């Protein structure tokens, strides 16, 4: 059964609700982004209207084989009418194609659903500036003050400088980056750019990247592993055993591996700064865990909500325990009392 926090009141709409069969009363299914916990249930046999971004629609058609007649892509930053209700899609600063959805209810209520997002001050100058928002369905992934991490720009500077130093010292070193979903493409693209290389990957991963409308992509990625010194592998293979095995396959072209695992937050953020990050090393293999987040930090989330001043907040993450729900509710009240709304 579909949970209450995936239903939009006063409409026939659900959000990220594809794993519950036919939802009673649902005339249109919205999909915020192409991550598996959100699309779970979609396939070539789905026959209801799906509303999403252009990029998300490309992935639905090519990766899940959803029939074109049921895919309804909408442009961003543009007022659209869906089943008699005005809606707007806004960039979520998450992965490629990810959106927030603004719903203008017939009765005058305005609802913002953030999907998954990384809050940024630039959102304060979008179409959100124009009107009041009554209810906020919020990505609360990191809603506690221990969740600190650096800017994406600082993390990429560290990665570029690290990779460039290592390969300039040893021209026979290979760089490897882990992936298991779309998102965080800047990590591998920025490293390849500084090294003058294309990024090598499987046919399946190449297909996925070709769906993302990234400018000049044909100049940056390849399926020819032998021509490339930046390789993408499944996140599960980024360990000493898996990387040793990969180095064997490269046929003595390389004699060292520098590997990156772009996690979200890990507890080592509480002690260390990005500049002081060090790898785990065994022989000629080194692995860096880098805190590249596509979700709001606690402080970023707090700033966004105190700017927006919603009348009611509905969390969409960490909803399953009473301890998590109580913790989040206490922070929402603090934020309201500090700001005066
Ligand atoms: C999500 C986040 C930010 C924005 C903006 C604000 N823009 C300011 C102008 C300079 C750079 C572009 C960004 C418009 N729509 C958005 C959706
Ligand atoms: Ni996501």
DSSP string, 65-130: ---GGGEEE--TT--EEETTEEEEEEE-SSSTT-EEEEEE-TTS-EEEE--S----GGGGGSGGGG
For residue 22, report the phi and psi dihedrals to the nearest 5 degrees.
-75, 115
Q: Is the CB of 129 under 6 A from ligand 1?
A: no
CA of 139 to the centre of ligand 2 (A): 10
Place of tokens 């004699």: 255
CA of 304 to the centre of ligand 1 (A): 14
In whole angstroms, give the CA distance from residue 306 to residue 334.
10
Q: 63-72: long-range contacts (C-beta < 8 A, 24 or more apart)?
A: 63/34, 63/207, 63/208, 63/211, 64/39, 66/42, 70/46
Ramachandran region of residue 25, left (φ > 0), alpha (ψ -120 to 50) or beta? left
CA of 287 to the centre of ligand 1 (A): 35
What is the pairing mode between strands 199-200 and 230-234? parallel
Look up residue 251 and give its DSSP letter. Answer: T
Q: Is the CB of 91 under 6 A from ligand 1?
A: yes
Q: Is the CB of 125 under 6 A from ligand 1?
A: yes
Ramachandran region of residue 340, left (φ > 0), alpha (ψ -120 to 50) or beta? left
Beta-carbon contacts of 199 under 8 Å, excluding residues fewer than 6 positions away, are 177, 188, 189, 192, 220, 221, 222, 228, 230, 231, 232
Query: Contact, 51 vs 74, CB < 8 A?
Result: yes
Q: Is the CB of 163 under 6 A from ligand 1?
A: no
Q: Is the CB of 247 under 6 A from ligand 1?
A: no
Query: Contact, 119 vs 300, CB < 8 A?
Result: yes
In whole angstroms, give the CA distance from residue 116 to residue 190.
24
Query: Contact, 257 vs 231, CB < 8 A?
Result: no
CA of 129 to the centre of ligand 1 (A): 11
> Can you say how many angstroms the Cα of residue 284 is from the centroid of all Cα atoms in its chain?
32
* CA torsion through residues 190, 191, 195, 201, sign: negative
Q: Which two tokens stand for residue 40?
A: 């779970």
Q: Which ligand is nearest to the CA of 128?
A: 1
In whole angstroms, give the CA distance from residue 282 to residue 22.
51
Give the angle subtended at the CA of 147 by the CAs of 146 and 148, to the nearest 5°. Answer: 105
Q: Is the CB of 77 under 6 A from ligand 1?
A: yes
Query: Contact, 56 vs 43, CB < 8 A?
Result: no
For residue 5, report the phi and psi dihedrals to the nearest 5 degrees.
-75, -5
Closest to 175 (Cα-Cα) out of 201, 214, 152, 153: 201
| Ligand 1: nearest atom to the Cα of 122 | 3
Query: Contact, 145 vs 300, CB < 8 A?
Result: no
* CA torsion through residues 58, 127, 87, 143, sign: positive
Q: Which two tokens stand for residue 175?
A: 């760089």
Query: Contact, 324 vs 140, CB < 8 A?
Result: no
Query: Contact, 135 vs 37, CB < 8 A?
Result: no
Query: Contact, 158 vs 335, CB < 8 A?
Result: no
Beta-carbon contacts of 310 under 8 Å, excluding residues fewer than 6 positions away, are 112, 133, 134, 135, 136
Query: What's this structure's resolution in Å?
Result: 1.5
Place of tokens 């065994």: 282
Closest to 178 (Cα-Cα) out of 55, 116, 263: 263
Query: Contact, 330 vs 320, CB < 8 A?
Result: no
Domains and CATH numbers, the chain: 1-147+296-341 (3.60.15.10), 148-295 (3.40.50.12650)
| Ligand 1: nearest atom to the Cα of 77 | 15
Look up residue 280 and give its DSSP letter. Answer: E
Measured in residues, the chain has a length of: 341
CA of 254 to the centre of ligand 2 (A): 35
In whole angstroms, give the CA distance from residue 96 to residue 55.
7
In whole angstroms, give the CA distance from residue 13 to residue 85.
10
Instruction: Count other C-beta atoms under 10 Å from residue 194's C-beta.
Output: 15
Q: Is the CB of 122 under 6 A from ligand 1?
A: yes
Q: Is the CB of 8 under 6 A from ligand 1?
A: no
Beta-carbon contacts of 6 under 8 Å, excluding residues fewer than 6 positions away, are 14, 15, 16, 17
In whole angstroms, give the CA distance from residue 206 to residue 189.
13
In whole angstroms, give the CA distance from residue 341 to residue 333.
10
In angstroms, the Cα distances linking 269 to 77, 277, 284 are: 35, 10, 26
Q: Which two tokens stand for residue 163?
A: 């990779």
In whole angstroms, give the CA distance from residue 87 to residue 103.
5
In whole angstroms, give the CA distance from residue 225 to residue 205.
13
In whole angstroms, give the CA distance from residue 65 to residue 58.
10
Instruction: Count other C-beta atoms under 10 Å from residue 7's C-beta.
Output: 16
Per DSSP (E only), the strands in the chain are 13-15, 28-30, 50-52, 71-73, 80-82, 85-91, 99-104, 110-113, 135-138, 173-179, 199-200, 221-222, 230-234, 256-263, 280-282, 285-291, 312-315
């Amino acid at each position: 059964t579909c949970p209450f926090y995936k239903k939009i009141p006063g409409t026939g709409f659900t959000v990220d609700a594809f794993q519950y069969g036919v939802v009673e009363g649902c005339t249109a299914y919205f999909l915020t982004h192409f991550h598996s916990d959100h699309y779970a249930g979609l396939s070539k046999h789905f026959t209801f209207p799906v509303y999403c971004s252009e990029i998300t629609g490309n992935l639905l058609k090519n990766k899940l084989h959803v029939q074109e007649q049921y895919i309804h892509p909408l442009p961003l930053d543009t007022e659209c009418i869906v089943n008699g209700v005005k809606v707007v899609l806004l960039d979520a600063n998450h992965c490629p194609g990810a959106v927030m959805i603004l719903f203008y209810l017939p009765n005058g209520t305005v609802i913002l659903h953030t999907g998954d997002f990384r809050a940024d001050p630039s959102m304060e100058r979008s179409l959100l500036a124009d009107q009041k928002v009554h209810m906020l369905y919020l990505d609360t992934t990191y809603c506690s003050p221990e969740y600190t991490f650096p800017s994406q720009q600082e993390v990429i500077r560290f990665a570029i400088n690290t990779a460039f130093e290592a390969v300039t010292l040893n021209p026979h070193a290979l760089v490897v980056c882990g992936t298991y979903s779309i998102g965080k493409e800047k990590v591998f693209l920025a490293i390849a750019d500084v090294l003058g290389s294309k990024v090598g990957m499987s046919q399946e991963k190449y297909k996925t990247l070709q769906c993302l409308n990234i400018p000049e992509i044909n100049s940056l990625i390849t399926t020819d592993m032998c021509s490339s010194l930046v390789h993408l592998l499944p996140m599960m293979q980024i360990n000493f055993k898996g990387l040793q095995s990969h180095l064997k396959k490269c046929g003595g072209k390389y004699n060292q591996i520098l590997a990156f695992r772009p996690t979200g937050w890990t507890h080592s953020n509480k002690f260390t700064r990005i500049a002081d990050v060090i790898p785990q090393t065994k022989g000629n293999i080194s692995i860096y865990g880098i805190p590249y987040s596509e979700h709001s930090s606690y402080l970023e989330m707090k700033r966004f909500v105190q700017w927006l001043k919603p009348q009611k907040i509905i969390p969409t993450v960490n909803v399953g325990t009473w301890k998590s729900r109580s913790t989040m509710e206490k922070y929402f009240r603090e934020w309201k009392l500090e700001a005066g709304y």
